[PDB]
């Protein structure tokens, strides 16, 4: 893969480390998104590691519902990340534009997220940053989990406290070692938000938030059907001996919850099912003097 192997079409957005672009392969006329990161910056911001670790993760994970990176490459001043081109937007803005989601819609999305989590987990890889913001929807309405900046290969336990305040689990707020089960806590919060419009322990200020998370009652809105109320009740628990996903049968207990009875995990996993919504219709790359950073962006 090379910069001449494609033809830039337009800027899709402006990241902190640089733009990203809409590109067409000039070999098969396929589309991708070029995420460009200026090395000069990545390092000014002491963000080298975080950047390489994402590339690795993306190199060792393949799933219908996990975004794909077909490759990288770099010139003398920035790295390039060729990635799936997702048409459809982010589950977050879809949510806000419609206050709350209804049981089945939420159920669908949860089901696909469950599947990718099942995968990641079966390889001792935990995600760690489950928000509606990192879930993108592609043209046909399916899901694509993005940003694997916080995913780590965790065979036993880990420590690093990261993620997003509301969707975070207790054992992380209070610096304890944790396995992949935090992912199930966050999963429960994603579901609560798709159905309520808000997170359960929200609070404009951070610590006030780590507070409730740590010491607050889980109260459900009335229209919540029992099932969801039960699932969320098992998912969003503070005691890991009872939290779904961390039990004798791992993912199976989540996949087998009543709330997911009419779900053929097999049909869904093949994208051979129907979707509840289909989304609708300087810059000097190539330069190459000396690169003081090469030593750090070698795998690219």
UniProtKB/Swiss-Prot annotation:
Q: Which GO terms describe its cellular component?
A: cAMP-dependent protein kinase complex; chromatin; cytoplasm; cytosol; nucleus
Q: Which UniProt keywords apply?
A: Acetylation, ATP-binding, cAMP, Cell cycle, Cell division, Cytoplasm, Kinase, Nucleotide-binding, Nucleus, Serine/threonine-protein kinase, Transferase
User: GO:BP terms for this protein?
Assistant: cell division; double-strand break repair via nonhomologous end joining; negative regulation of cytoplasmic mRNA processing body assembly; protein import into nucleus; protein kinase A signaling; Ras protein signal transduction; regulation of macroautophagy; signal transduction
Query: Which amino acids does the record list as binding ATP?
Result: 12-20, 35
User: Could you state a single Gene Ontology molecular function term?
Assistant: ATP binding
Q: Any idea of its EC number?
A: 2.7.11.11
AGC-kinase C-terminal domain: which residues?
261-300
State the remark under miscellaneous: Present with 4320 molecules/cell in log phase SD medium.
Q: What is this protein called?
A: cAMP-dependent protein kinase type 1
Q: Which gene encodes it?
A: TPK1
Q: Please give the first and last residues shown and the length of the full protein.
A: 82 to 397 of 397
């Amino acid at each position: 893969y090379s910069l001449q192997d494609f033809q830039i079409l337009r800027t899709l957005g402006t990241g902190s480390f640089g733009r990203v672009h809409l590109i067409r392969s000039r070999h098969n006329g396929r589309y991708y998104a070029m995420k460009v990161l200026k090395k000069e910056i990545v390092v000014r911001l002491k963000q080298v590691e975080h950047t390489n670790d994402e590339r690795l993760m993306l190199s060792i994970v393949t799933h219908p519902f996990i975004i794909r990176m077909w490759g990288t490459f770099q010139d003398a001043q920035q790295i390039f990340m060729i990635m799936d081109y997702i048409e459809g937007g982010e589950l977050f803005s879809l949510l806000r534009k419609s206050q709350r989601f209804p049981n089945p819609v939420a159920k669908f999305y949860a089901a696909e997220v469950c599947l990718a989590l099942e995968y990641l987990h079966s390889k001792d890889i935990i995600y760690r940053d489950l928000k509606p913001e990192n879930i993108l929807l592609d043209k046909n309405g399916h899901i694509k989990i993005t940003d694997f900046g916080f995913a780590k290969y965790v065979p036993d336990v880990t420590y690093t406290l990261c993620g997003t305040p509301d969707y975070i689990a207790p054992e992380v707020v209070s610096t304890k070692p944790y396995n992949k089960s935090i992912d199930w806590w966050s999963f429960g919060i994603l579901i609560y938000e798709m159905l309520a419009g808000y997170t359960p322990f929200y609070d404009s200020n951070t610590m006030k938030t780590y507070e409730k998370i740590l010491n607050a009652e889980l109260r459900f809105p009335p229209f919540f059907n029992e099932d969801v109320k039960d699932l969320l009740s098992r998912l969003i628990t503070r005691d890991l001996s009872q939290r779904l996903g961390n039990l004798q049968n791992g993912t199976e207990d989540v996949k087998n919850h009543p709330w997911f009875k009419e779900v053929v995990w097999e049909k869904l996993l093949s994208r051979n099912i129907e979707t509840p919504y289909e989304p609708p219709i300087d810059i000097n790359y190539g330069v190459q003097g000396e690169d003081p950073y090469a030593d750090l962006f070698r795998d690219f």
